[PDB]
Structure formats: C-alpha cells, structure tokens
Amino acid sequence: AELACFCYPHLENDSYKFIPFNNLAIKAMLTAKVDKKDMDKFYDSIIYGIAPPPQFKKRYNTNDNSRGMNFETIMFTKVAMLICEALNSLKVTQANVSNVLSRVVSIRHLENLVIRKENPQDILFHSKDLLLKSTLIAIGQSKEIETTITAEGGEIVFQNAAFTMWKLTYLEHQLMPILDQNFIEYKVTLNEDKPISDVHVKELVAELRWQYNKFAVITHGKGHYRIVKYSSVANHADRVYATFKSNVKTGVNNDFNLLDQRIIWQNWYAFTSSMKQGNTLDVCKRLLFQKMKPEKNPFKGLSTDRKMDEVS
Amino acid sequence: AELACFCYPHLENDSYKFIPFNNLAIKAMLTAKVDKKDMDKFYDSIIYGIAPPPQFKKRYNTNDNSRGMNFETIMFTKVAMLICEALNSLKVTQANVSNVLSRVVSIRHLENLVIRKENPQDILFHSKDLLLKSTLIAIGQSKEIETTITAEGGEIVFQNAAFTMWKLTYLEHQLMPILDQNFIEYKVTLNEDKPISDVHVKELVAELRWQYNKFAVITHGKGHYRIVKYSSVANHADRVYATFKSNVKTGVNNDFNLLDQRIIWQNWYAFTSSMKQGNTLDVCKRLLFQKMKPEKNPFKGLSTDRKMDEVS
Amino acid sequence: AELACFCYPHLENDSYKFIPFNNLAIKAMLTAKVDKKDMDKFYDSIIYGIAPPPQFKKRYNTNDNSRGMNFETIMFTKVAMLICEALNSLKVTQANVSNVLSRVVSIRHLENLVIRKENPQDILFHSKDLLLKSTLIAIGQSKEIETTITAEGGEIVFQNAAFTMWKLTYLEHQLMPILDQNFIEYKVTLNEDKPISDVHVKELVAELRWQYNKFAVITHGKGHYRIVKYSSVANHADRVYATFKSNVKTGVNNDFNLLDQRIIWQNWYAFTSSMKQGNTLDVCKRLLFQKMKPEKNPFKGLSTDRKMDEVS
Amino acid sequence: AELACFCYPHLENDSYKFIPFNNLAIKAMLTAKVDKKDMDKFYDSIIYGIAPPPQFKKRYNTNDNSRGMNFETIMFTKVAMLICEALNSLKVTQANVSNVLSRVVSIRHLENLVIRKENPQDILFHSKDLLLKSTLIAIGQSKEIETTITAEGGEIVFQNAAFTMWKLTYLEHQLMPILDQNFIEYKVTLNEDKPISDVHVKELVAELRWQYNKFAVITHGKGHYRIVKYSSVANHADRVYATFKSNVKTGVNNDFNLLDQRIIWQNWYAFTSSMKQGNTLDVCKRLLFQKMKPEKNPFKGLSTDRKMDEVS
Amino acid sequence: AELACFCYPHLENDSYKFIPFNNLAIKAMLTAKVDKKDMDKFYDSIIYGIAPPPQFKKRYNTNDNSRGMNFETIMFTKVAMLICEALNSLKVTQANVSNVLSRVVSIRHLENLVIRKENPQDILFHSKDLLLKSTLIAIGQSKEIETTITAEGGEIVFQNAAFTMWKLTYLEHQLMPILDQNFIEYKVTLNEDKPISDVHVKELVAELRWQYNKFAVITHGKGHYRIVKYSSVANHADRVYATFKSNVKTGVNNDFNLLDQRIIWQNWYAFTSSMKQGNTLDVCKRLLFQKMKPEKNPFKGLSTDRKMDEVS
Numbered sequence A, B, C, D, E: 001a002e003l004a005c006f007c008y009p010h011l012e013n014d015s016y017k018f019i020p021f022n023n024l025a026i027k028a029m030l031t032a033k034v035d036k037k038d039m040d041k042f043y044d045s046i047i048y049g050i051a052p053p054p055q056f057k058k059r060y061n062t063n064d065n066s067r068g069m070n071f072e073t074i075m076f077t078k079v080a081m082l083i084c085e086a087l088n089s090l091k092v093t094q095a096n097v098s099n100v101l102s103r104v105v106s107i108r109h110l111e112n113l114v115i116r117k118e119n120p121q122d123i124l125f126h127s128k129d130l131l132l133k134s135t136l137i138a139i140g141q142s143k144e145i146e147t148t149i150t151a152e153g154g155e156i157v158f159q160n161a162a163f164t165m166w167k168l169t170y171l172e173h174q175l176m177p178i179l180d181q182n183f184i185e186y187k188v189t190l191n192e193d194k195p196i197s198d199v200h201v202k203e204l205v206a207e208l209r210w211q212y213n214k215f216a217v218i219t220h221g222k223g224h225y226r227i228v229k230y231s232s233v234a235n236h237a238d239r240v241y242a243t244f245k246s247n248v249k250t251g252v253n254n255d256f257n258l259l260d261q262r263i264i265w266q267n268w269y270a271f272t273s274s275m276k277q278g279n280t281l282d283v284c285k286r287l288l289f290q291k292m293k294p295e296k297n298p299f300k301g302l303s304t305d306r307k308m309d310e311v312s
C-alpha cells in the first residue's frame, strides 16, 4: 500500500511533519459520499481528524473487501508511527512530499520491523540509528541495501559467518497477513559487505538443498535471496519484470543484483539475466519453464554429506 | 432522569459546587424509612455520604424495579462526574439551583458523551471546551444546538459535507440500555461547517430512501433528524407532544425547529406543524395516520399572501 | 457439481443401481498418481472401495482448493444417498447412464432437500412420492416444474394463497456453503398451478417493494422467482445466458418462462425477452444497465399503504 | 391462551379428533398475508400442515412480541399432545367443537401437568385416568374441583392430613414463564373433599403466619387457596372481578367458593363477598384498601408456639 | 482468636511496635518440634522471621484442622496490619503489653473492618481517626460503644434516623468464614448513642416484624441489637452467660446493656435480666423456653399497617 494510507503531511517551518491517521477517521471516510474531483484529497471526518484520500478505499479491509489491511488493529497505529518517525527525520520539502507519500511499500515488511523494534533482545530496540536506517530502506527512502542488521525480520532458521536465513511469518501478522494457509517463504540476508568464502557459500547451498529442496532460490535484485516454493516462481517473475519495466519507464534507479550464480536457481538466473539484457517478458519468462542443461555443479556431494551426517 | 439523581449541590461563596453520589449511598437510601416531609430532601447515608432524595427511588434499578438505571456500574460514576464538571462551570446560584437539578435529561445521551470523551481518537478527548459545550447541550443548560461536532455520538454510517448519520448504540449501554432487542434508531446531525448545498441534501435523501426505506425521517425539534422505524412513530409523537405541552404549562419557551420539508416525512411535518399551532394531541395524531400525497409547491402563493397582507 | 461426484453405477439385472462413494475413497483418489488416459475412469482406492474419476478433483475441497465441496461431512453422504434413491427409481439403462451422471446440479439445492426430508414436520418426511419428485426435479431428471410443495426449501419468510417466499440459508450449509458472508438470496415458488388473482400478485409485490427494496426480482426461466441483490444481477445474467445458449447448442428443451411482467424487474424482463428473441449476450445484457422509461405501474401506492399500516 | 392455539379438529368417522400443530406451521402462519374474513379460519402452511387461525398471532412470541408463548420449544408439543389426549377422550360433537377450542386456559398450569405426568415418581405417570381428569379440569372441560391428587403441581413445601402446599415454579417454565424475576406464588389444595378439623386448619394457618407472613391468603373461587404477595392483591382482585363479570354477562354460573373465613385474608373475604352480592368493582375494591377492625382470630398465639418450637 | 495470632511486639523506644507475621513463618512453626517450656514463646523460623507461639497451632487451618483461620490468604495480612496500626497508636508499654496480645477477638469483625477501610465510598477510607476508633473497639482496647459510624460493616438492609441494620456476610469471608451454609445474621447499630423517639423505635420494630419475623431480636450487652434465627438463640444464651460469668470471675466489669424492652424478644430480655440479677445458668436459661404471658404490645397494629401499605 501507499505510504499515504498511514499518515498525512503537516507543514511546520520549512519542513513537513507526518501524522498517523486515526482508524475511526478512516472508517468514517469509508462510509463517505465524495465527489470524483475530491477522491485524491484528504478527508475530514470532523470528529476523528483527517483521513486518507478516498481513492485508497480498497487498501482497507471491510465487509466487502479482504484484499486490504486491518486498519483497526493496534499494529496499524504502530506501523503508521514507524513510518512517521522515519519520514520526520528526512525534512521532506514542499516539492517532494507527494512523491514520498505515493511510494507503494510492503506493509508486512513494516509490521516485521515493528516486531524487531519492540523486542528488547533485538539491536533495533537499542539503536535509533539502525531502526531509522532499516525503516528508510523499507519505505523506499534509502540507497542502502537491506542486510542482516537492517533486515525486516522473522525467525532465524539458519546462520553462518556470511548469511542469515529468516522465516517470514506472514501467516501470523495482524495488519496484513497472508491469507493462503499454504504460504511459506524465507529470505537470506548477507551479514556483511565483504567477500564471501567458497566454504560459507557451500554451507548455505547445502542447507538449502537438504532442508528446503522444494524451494527455488531467487532474488528480486535488491541484494538478498528469497526462498520461495517452485509453485510460486511464475508469479514472482511477473512481479519482478513489472517492477523492472516500470523503473525503466520512470528512469528510476533500476540496479538489479543477480547475486551468486552458484546459489540462485539456474532458471531464475537465466530469466533475470535475459531481463537485464532488455528482452521482453515472453522471451524472459519462458526460460523459467524450460528444463536446462544442468550447469557445472560447483558443489557436488553436498546432500550426501548432510545425509551421512544425519545418519551418524 | 433528573440531574439530582447524579449529584447534590454544595454552596461555596456565591455559587454552587456539585458533588457526585457514591453508589452505596444510593443503595442505603433505597432501604431507608423517611418522613413524607423529607422525601424531597437529599439523604444522609451516614456511612457513604449524601444520597439523592428518596422521591427518586424509581429512577434506580432494584430487585423490584428494572425500569431505572444501573447505578452500581462504573458508568454511573463517569456520567455523574461529567454532569458535575459541566454544572461546576456554570456558577449556579441560589436562584437557579432547584430548576437546574430538577431538569430531566437523557441518560443514554450522557453515556454516549462519556464514550466520546474517553476515546483518544475523538476531538472531545482533546477539547475541554467542546466537551463542556456538548455536555451543557445534553443537560439542558445551553442555548446552543447539537451538531456533528457536539453530537452524542455512536457509529458513523454515512457522511457528506453537510451531514453525519449516526447509529445509536443504546442496546450496548451500561447505565440505562434500551431493553427491547428489536431497537434500531439513527440520527443525522448537521456538520454546520458551511451553508448547505442541495447536492448534499439530495445525497442524504437518496441514502435514506435506498438504505433506510423502512424508517421514518422525523425530528424532536432540537435541530437534528431522527431516523426511526415507522412502527415507532406514534410513540415518538406522544413523547414530543408531552414535552411540548409541558413546556407550555410550565412556561419554558417552545423552540420547535421543523427543519427541511424535503427531508422530514410529510406526515411528521404535518403533525408537528399542527402541534406548534396549539392543537390537541388527538387532532395532531390524526395527521400521522392519514394517507397523504406530497405537496407539490410549498412556495406557491407566497407573493399573493404578501399582497393580501398589504390590503388588510 | 456433476452427479458423478456422489455415486457410481452398478449393473444389476438390466438396470443400473447407484452407490454412494466413501469419503476416504475420494480422499485416496486425491493423493493418487493417474495416467491421462484414466482421468475419466472410476478410481480404485483398494481399501475404501470405488472413487469418482480423477478428472473431478476440483469438485472437492482440500488444502489447496476451497472452490469445491466438503466431501468428508455427513451431509455429503446424505446428499449422495438422496441422489442414489432418486436415480434407483428410474431404472436407468446402459445407454443413458453416462448422460445421467454427467448432469451438473446445484449441491446446495440437494442439501436443502435433505434438510426438508429429515424434518418430521415437513411433508417430504412423510411422502416418498413427493420426496422423489422433488429430487428428480433437482437432479435434472424430471419435466415437472419446482413448486412450493417440491421446493428446495429454506426458511419461509412470506406466504399467501398463491406464493411462498423462502430464504436460502446457504451461509449455514455443511456440504457447499456460500463463502461470501454478504450473501443473501430468496426464491418465491408458486403454491398451485392455477390462475393467480390480481390481489394475490399485489400482495407479493407489496411485500417485495417494502421488505426487499434493495433486491431485484428475477427468474432463471424454470418457473419461480429469484430475489437477488441488484449488485449480483450482472452475474445472474451471465449464468442465465450461458445456460440458454448451451441448451440451444445441444438442442435440449430450452423453455424459458418469463413469469409475470408485473412482478419481474423491468430491466430483467427486457434482458430475458431479448435473449429469447435470439439476440447476442451484448445486445441482451446491456439492457440491464440502462435506466428505462418506468412502465405503467400496475400497483401504485403499495409502499405507502404498507407504510401507513406500520404507523398504525 | 385459547385451546385453538395448540390443536385443530379433524373429523374421523363419528367425531372429531384433535391434532397438535407443527411449530413450523405456526411460524409460516406468522408470515402469512391473510384476508380479513379468513382471520378466524385454520391456516394451511402447505409445507408443515395446518396452523392456528391468524387472529391468534399475538399468542406467539416472535422478534417483535414477548407477551406470548415460546411455541418452538418441545414443551409446546408436549402441552399440545396433553390437550389433544384429553380432548380425544371426550368424543366432542359438531355442536361443541368451536366452543371447546375457544376456551382460554392457563398454559403454565398445563406445562406443570406435563412436568407431573412425565415423572415416574408421580401418580399421574401411572394413572391415565387421573391424568385425564387433571387435564380436563385445567382445560375447562370438567365439573370436578382441582384437589391435591389432580393438582397442577410444582414443589411441595408443606403438607398435613388436610392440605398440600405447592410452590408454583413459573419462573423456570419453558413455554410461557413469568418474566418478572420478583415473582413468588403458592397454592394450597385440599387433599380430599371432606370436612376439615379445627386442628388441621390451625396447622395450615400456623405455617402460613410463620413461614409466609408477607403473603395474602386468597382464592379465585375454584376450590383452592392462592398464596400471593400483598403487593399483587389488587391485581388479583381485577382479574377475579373481570372473570366474575364476564360469566354473569355470558350467563355462566360462577360458583365462587369463598373458602374458610378463618384462613382467607379478611379484606379478600370482604371483597369477594361484596362481589358475590352483586356490587360494582369500585365498591368491592374499596373494601380491599380499608383498614377494617379485626375480627377476633380463632387461633390465638400460633406464631408464639412456632417460635418456642424453634428455640427448643 | 488471640491478637498474638497476628503479630508480635518489638520494643523500639519508650514503647512497643507491633509487627505482622509472615504466613510462611507460621507455616514453618506448624511443622516445628518445640519443647513444652517454649510453647508460649514466639517462634523463630529462621527463614521467614518470627512466628506465633506454638500453643496457638489450632488457630490455623491445616490438613488436619478446619476449625481455625486461613492464614495464607491476603486477608490474613490485611487483618494483621489493621491490628498493628491500631496497637501502634497506643504506645503500649511493658505494663500492658502481655494483656493486649492475649485478648481474644472476632476475626470476622476485623475482616469486615478491612472491607470498610479499603472502600473509597466508606468514611473509614477517608478518616484514619474513625478507622482507629472502630478497630480499637473491635480489639477490646476502647471503652467506646460500637455505633453505626464505627460498625464492623456488612450490607445495609434498613436505615432510619435512629438505626442502621446490617447483614453480616460471614459466608463470603476469606480469613475465617462461617461454614454452615444455613447461616444468616443481622445487626442493628444505633446511629447515635442518644435517646430515641417512640416513632423511630416503632419504625424499626415494624421492619423487624414484617421482614424478619422468623428472627429473634437479642443483644450481647455491648450496645447493639443482634438479629438471629430463633433456632440459634439457646447457643447465643450459652455464649453470653459464659462471658458474663467469666467477667465476674475475672474481676472485669460486665456492664450488660439490656437495650430496649420494646424491641428485644421478651424471652431474651427475661433471660438476660435474670442473668444480670446473679441467677444460675439453669434458672436464667429456662426462661428462654417458657411460653410467657404476652406483655402489653407497645405498638399494636404495626403488621396491619405494612400489609395495607403493600396492598396499595
């Protein structure tokens, strides 16, 4: 959803402050009769303060909508506040305010950051610097790459010197949970920006082959691995191409990190490489469904080793 | 119930302070044997402080009474405090204290204000000024008219630039809930920001005809619309007439605002107009039960009437 | 779903007997690996008897399917038995068996018949003749029209000499409930095959206008009225045209009863008339969205009468 | 309610057989549009058999009515069957059928009889003769007086050679419970129709004065004592007088048994005596509220004896 | 129990400070092996501080004892603190220190004072002086008579200018509840220890005769009325005489206030009068069981007046 679904701008001095919507203001807006010309304008609930532009009605869950967010939960407020705190640190100017608020982001990523931030065990709880950096990355206001330290979060299920693997517990989210109960997804973030040894790569690949054999190892080009069911790959390709195409259109920074060819699923590496080369969706995407000549396996015997390890 | 059911006066210098009753003081009063001459006097429970005059026993729910209020709930205390705060701002004098305390008010309206006041999302939570105004209107100590901003509240089910429609949550009340489970009633308050446009009048009437076709649009003359089941119209008629009649008997001025003839149910407009002309209840109600086709042109003859006035 | 989802044929004498599937046989079939050539063949679970052809997998709810039926409920067995009892009375021959089982029917209609049949208050409980007739109508093996006596059932919400109105309680079904919690639908069946007086029509129309103003009065041409939300009409038109088109294709009896033009929604009568006249979907369907010149209202003042009735 | 609210007559051979209504038939009738002239006729639900005449609608509890009976409970069916069994033993004639069913009876009395007859400890369980007799008395088809053996029932709280005292547990009833939670009432039936010794009368009076001092001892003239709160006495006077008047008007002999003047409350004896003498309600009632000079009581110091027994 | 069951003395400066036992110190003491010589010495649990003298073991509930107090409840600690607060205000010296802790008091009376004290509605909550007075009276360290203001507490069930009647809720107590579920007792305290008008006495007697006719009105001579079941009177007599006899033998003054003969049960008045005259238990107590010549009824017709009030 757009950042504009959570907060509205308020001019103080030369700079804009951002304020969370009250959930009852949103609720009022959803029952409102509004002229077409005012669909893109902030809404006055009268009793509960300002509400988001009515054009965003479908971002919110109601009796007849389950494709939006549960804005009446406490997590909505927590996420809104997370966003506001980050935006407030930016000193957004008159010129940029609309651009900033129109950015569409992952709400689940933000709920996960709230979960990190509120846990006294977690570094984000103790470092406002890292919390802000992590949030800025999540709301499209940073050039920095998401790494282990700034990761959205979840449950750590594997870790070595170079990598941290997280289970994304989207089924249990309050604000915008995944509704398909068969959903399972992980991400692998890089611990440091530093050359990674063959040994540490091998360790990750061995874990992925043994423990997550039914998962494709892919990436959306933003600097981390996404571990997804093979049955979901086509959808990921659609999302990835569209984002890439759009960035080419708006001339926005369209840097796409392919990541390690020894780790990424062979077909996905082919699909994304062809995409970067400037091919159309159809040329790209069909590479996903093709059985390819198995590349020179950089790490033979990995699964057998894990197997023998388990037996002993 | 009378305001004297919630608090008692204490003279301090030149004006009164009002103090809420302890619920156990009321409970003791209910078991008390009192001289007839003392039925109208505030009661000393000895252990729990002053209590309301025994003449108001029937205002309180007991084993042999379910037609009063639940004075042992926390809401009783909250409503009593709301009343006291408003009354304390008035500087009530000896000349007026009896009249003030004898004013009968809607307890449900007051519970609804407590509900608004205690919600951080609601402007009443943040504006002592508006809270006082809203309360003063509710307890009959204001010249002001209830509007959206000063409304008793409830659930907003429709809103446009000119109007806010509220569902009244009376079934869920703690202090004096409606006990008939078939109860459904709404109210429409004017936002009163700017002059009203007929665009917004048409929108309201369309919502009412389409979504609430089984409800009569009426008013009790206090400046807002009441959306009631047609099957409850006769009862509202009786209540409205009694209040009107009583104000005539006593001497209080009857300000009955008829509102918009295009919005009010035609029969209700006729009934209230006849009432305002001093007709008996029997004559007024006949209009309620009469089949009646809408008035084409209520403004026809306005100039001719002015003409004949000049001739006279 | 197809009748073939509930039972399989077994040759006894010259005639076919029909036997319900065990739900664990179906469950086994859903986990089975089957050759393309055998998708249309009955499945042998080995342990739990015969199961339906694997081509019907999507008729059954599983972890990854919510668009089918809950075949593990007792209602599945009850419906299967209802079907078998009716089919067994037919003495289906070798030639017809495949045709009979391929018929797609409403499962909810059948669950409703089970609910009627199992209620000792209901005539279907006491008359095997009427139960069989009702079931045959429901499974496409009868020329008879569904009437009040043979109705699928539900809750009676209105009745007069000529009509019976039923609420379809699909939200509460066990086998294949409607999942959209906003669903509401009724049907009006004719009590007798006998001319209906203007008075009795007027009574129905008055009820529909007063109590169900937000519902379109339509029909699928099979001899009864369907009372559906206006917001669902376009979908009904799609379903109705497809069925009509298909029947023209297979040369199947394509009799479409328009029903009473004084009762049916004006636009729906236009749409279905144009359909019968042989027009395309686009010519037909667009009549639904057009505001038409209100036809000569056969019953003026109906809503006003009900209104005045309620007030008194 | 009238007997016609529970069953309808069906002519078999020589005479009428009474058959209980299905509760869904009643439920259908409540939704039915019926011609004015047919309001007093038995209603055909089509689906669920015959229903009571629509003129009796208010006898049945619905969403908008709480003053009737809960006809969807199993007790409705049990009461109906009890009525039917009694009526079917009478061989009612054509000339009598309508009057028999028009009789208004106590539904609570009937539920109590059901409670008696279904209890294997109770004599009514083991004697169809006594059961029929008890029921015929309750439904106004007997010249017999209700005694202990044929009592409606309840809980026995006192018993001696001559009397049995019952607590009427109307609060716990399923069909038509008393809704006032403050309700308490007892009845004292005579164990047999014989002269009662002074000693056995004195024993009853002693118990009433000691254990039930806040209760008036009255009678409705049907041969037993009713023990009711003094605060309900005036209401009993209204009901009793109303019934007495009704009988005199319709030429029915009241046969009002005053009962023992040594037991009945003095003011009640005066009231009913004045009623039998033919006086107006106003004149009779005036005797209820008259602090009349005590008659000397024929049982001195009964409470003193009980006190001393308690202390020992 | 003895005050020494709740606290121990600690000399501080000129006088003793009293300190509550930890419940685990008591629990330890209950398992302790102690010399007979030390049974009357305070016990050192080592772990949980000082404990009561082992001679008081039976005052505490354990697996083999249910006749004591529940010392592990929070009410134990509250009562203990209530006692200490009162004793500490006395500046007890070596002179009286031992007699103070030996005094046996009503634990239930003390729990009731805690219940009064902790209630913001109660005057004891706001006045430390009245709280101390009330407690000092309850623990036998005051010459003042218990009145309404200083009452132990309970539920107010009647009140007039002169009296307050309390229900003792001993069944619900935590520390040492009455275990006989048949228990019911009230007390009537004087609002002021001043002469009381005949009218105000009459009001009390009328309430007692009407609402509490099965209760004997007695007193234990300490300045208030106790309303007890007639079946408990003989036991009260034994307790009262034993205390009187004991006070005589222990030099302590009796000061038995017989209270008002127009209120007290005749037999109790005779018994206690005879007691005050120095007669033996046999002579005193037999007056309880004698049917006495009725005394001139001071207020004839009280019962009739209430009856008439109830009927109207």
Ligand SMILES: [Cl-]
Binding pocket: A219, A220, A221, A222, A223, A224, A225, A226
């Ligand atoms: Cl990525």
Ligand SMILES: [Cl-]
Binding pocket: B219, B220, B221, B222, B223, B224, B225, B226
């Ligand atoms: Cl109003």
Ligand SMILES: [Cl-]
Binding pocket: C219, C220, C221, C222, C223, C224, C225, C226
């Ligand atoms: Cl149809």
Ligand SMILES: [Cl-]
Binding pocket: D219, D220, D221, D222, D223, D224, D225, D226
């Ligand atoms: Cl009687």
Ligand SMILES: [Cl-]
Binding pocket: E219, E220, E221, E222, E223, E224, E225, E226
């Ligand atoms: Cl005492």
Ligand code: NA
Binding pocket: D034, D038, D039, D040, D041, D042, D043, D044, D053, D054
């Ligand atoms: Na009828």
